[PDB]
Structures are given as structure tokens and as C-alpha cells.
Design a protein around this nucleic acid. Structure first.
Ligand SMILES: [Mg+2]
Ligand SMILES: [Mg+2]
Ligand code: NA
Ligand code: NA
Ligand code: NA
Ligand code: NA
Ligand code: NA
Ligand code: NA
Ligand code: NA
Ligand code: NA
Ligand code: NA
Ligand code: NA
Ligand code: NA
Ligand code: NA
Ligand code: NA
Ligand code: NA
Ligand code: NA
Ligand code: NA
Ligand code: NA
Ligand code: NA
Ligand SMILES: [Pt+2]
Ligand SMILES: [Pt+2]
Ligand SMILES: [Zn+2]
Ligand SMILES: [Zn+2]
Ligand SMILES: [Zn+2]
Ligand SMILES: [Zn+2]
Lengths: 142, 142
DNA sequence: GAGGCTTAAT
DNA sequence: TAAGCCTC
DNA sequence: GAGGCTTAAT
DNA sequence: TAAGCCTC
């Protein structure tokens, strides 16, 4: 129910981080996507507006490989490369040879994203995802 | 059918590397295991002799998670962190909290070893392994 | 002949 | 974690 | 308020 | 790849 000072959207608490960040998850994920694309030499055909509509809202976000919810993934307490608790789902370039685009983008948790790496196709990763989903369901996580 | 200058064993060509290394795969893997254990603060209850018997020979080695053969994995042309073609299977500490030991050791290809990381139990990874095995069998690799 | 190294792509 | 390079 | 950063564990 | 820190 707070407004994000970056996108100006009116949003629930679950669209924000638990730490000292003032940006919403959509804005921070968009910033990362942009910086990452340029750093790695990947094209980016999303605009911020299309990305934000694509990214939707926290309670609707689930990893497209293992099915874990954003809240479920948050409860794993995974850390990012700077050492902070990961609290949102990221974006997989389905075809790892292609860039970020509406057609090539798939929502993915950081565990599945790193697993898939540039080793497995999306099709192959669909299969790994079901196996990962069984680990979560085995731990009591949705 | 060549002797390894380090262990003194009489061994087939498939127990040696394709590059400029003079050490056999068993000797190089043992060296890595020792250095890795000390670098990471893991115990190591293998002796070189028990490790070499445990490690066996190339044609018998298959990853304990995905089932890929050492030759199959070699054909993937994966690279190690120094940038060289990986030509042998490595060792997973089943319980990632425990060190290297006959009881805790499992043979694993570098793909499954990195996937399992310290995220999944051996039991959970058994399940991911079957899914990874389907990717290989789908590519025509045993 | 011995053995320290640097660290995927995501 | 993993194979070759480079200094011993 | 904008946006560059550093890089799991194996 | 991903969230907070720190310099603008
Ligand atoms: Mg990806
Ligand atoms: Mg392991
Ligand atoms: Na909401
Ligand atoms: Na991103
Ligand atoms: Na554009
Ligand atoms: Na979703
Ligand atoms: Na963690
Ligand atoms: Na945490
Ligand atoms: Na599966
Ligand atoms: Na399980
Ligand atoms: Na032989
Ligand atoms: Na090893
Ligand atoms: Na000992
Ligand atoms: Na085996
Ligand atoms: Na490769
Ligand atoms: Na190669
Ligand atoms: Na499975
Ligand atoms: Na397949
Ligand atoms: Na890298
Ligand atoms: Na590290
Ligand atoms: Pt941020
Ligand atoms: Pt070597
Ligand atoms: Zn925002
Ligand atoms: Zn996932
Ligand atoms: Zn040897
Ligand atoms: Zn494997």
C-alpha cells in the first residue's frame, strides 16, 4: 500500500525488500536486467513498462522450472553474490544464446537459473525443474 | 599400458589425460582431493592407496547421480576453473557438512557436483540425477 | 619428479 | 571442484 | 533520487 | 545473476 519512489506505483509490502532498499522488487529487477544485459553483451528488447507488466506482482510469481513461489524461495534464505538474502525471482533467457526479450524470458528462481546455466535447454530444464519441485515439496515448501 | 611416474601403476591410455600432463587421472584426482580438503577445512580420511582402489579405472567410472560414464562426460567438453577440458569424474562429499572419506564419498561428474553444491541432499540429488540422465540419454550420451 | 595455483555461467 | 603450467 | 558495483559452493 | 551500500 506504499508508493515506489522509482516507478511511482502504488504497491503492497510484498513488492518491497525487507532490508534498507527503497526501490520495489520490479524496479530493482529491471535495473539488474539492464546492467546485466549490457555487462554480458546480451540484447534487451524489454522496456521498463513492458517488463513491469511482465513481472507482475509477488504473490503471482512462481519459478517456471520448479514452481516455487517467490515467498517459498525467500524462505530458503539463499544469498546473492554480494551476500544478501534473495527475496525475489529472476529472469531466465530460455535460449541462453539469445538476449532478454518477452519471447525469450522465463521467470526463474536463482537456484534453477544457476543450475540451467548455459548447460541445459529449457526443455531439459523443465525436466530438472520437476525433480527440484519434489525436493521443495519434500521439505514442505510451495 | 604405460606406467604412471607418480603411483608406479601399469595403466591403459584411458587412465591418462589427453594434454601435456604426466600424472594419471587417479594421481591428479588424489592431489586435488588433498589440496581441496585442506583449502576448504574438510577432513580427509582416505589414504592415497585406499583412494586409488576406490577410484578404480576409467571404463568403470560413472557419475553416481546421473549415470554418465567418464568417456560420456569427457565428450561434453566441459572446462575446469583454469580453462581446461575435464576428462575425469570427481568426488562428491555426500553429506556436504562432512569431509572426504570412504563412507561419505560418492563419484560425481562436475556438472552434478556443482548442481548439488551445498543445496541438495544426496537423496534429493538422486532425483535430480535421474532428470539429468534423461538429458544425456536425449542427446545420445551414455 | 613434487605440488601450488584460480575459480562456469548464471 | 580440476588439468595443465610453472617454479622448485 | 540514480545507478555502479561483485561474483555460491562445488 | 541480485539487494543493499556508497558515491554522486
Ligand atoms: Mg538463465
Ligand atoms: Mg559435492
Ligand atoms: Na499487492
Ligand atoms: Na535480472
Ligand atoms: Na529498447
Ligand atoms: Na508466475
Ligand atoms: Na544460504
Ligand atoms: Na538471509
Ligand atoms: Na523429472
Ligand atoms: Na525429497
Ligand atoms: Na585399463
Ligand atoms: Na577431487
Ligand atoms: Na590420514
Ligand atoms: Na562407478
Ligand atoms: Na564448455
Ligand atoms: Na575442450
Ligand atoms: Na526425477
Ligand atoms: Na531431453
Ligand atoms: Na565468471
Ligand atoms: Na567462492
Ligand atoms: Pt536496489
Ligand atoms: Pt596434474
Ligand atoms: Zn518501483
Ligand atoms: Zn526454481
Ligand atoms: Zn598415477
Ligand atoms: Zn552427473
Amino acid at each position: 500500500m506504499t508508493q515506489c519512489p522509482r516507478c511511482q506505483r502504488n504497491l503492497a509490502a510484498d513488492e518491497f525488500y525487507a532490508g534498507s532498499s527503497k526501490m520495489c522488487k520490479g524496479c530493482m529487477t529491471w535495473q539488474n536486467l539492464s546492467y546485466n544485459a549490457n555487462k554480458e553483451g546480451h540484447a534487451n528488447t524489454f522496456t521498463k513498462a513492458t517488463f513491469l507488466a511482465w513481472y507482475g506482482l509477488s504473490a503471482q510469481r512462481h519459478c517456471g522450472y520448479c514452481g516455487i513461489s517467490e515467498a517459498g524461495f525467500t524462505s530458503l534464505h539463499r544469498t546473492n553474490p554480494r551476500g544478501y538474502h534473495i527475496q525475489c525471482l529472476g529472469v531466465d533467457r530460455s535460449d541462453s544464446f539469445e538476449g532478454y526479450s518477452p519471447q525469450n524470458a522465463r521467470l526463474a528462481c536463482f537456484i534453477c537459473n544457476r543450475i540451467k546455466s548455459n548447460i541445459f535447454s529449457a526443455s531439459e530444464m523443465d525436466v530438472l525443474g520437476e525433480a527440484i519441485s519434489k525436493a521443495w515439496h519434500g521439505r514442505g515448501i510451495a
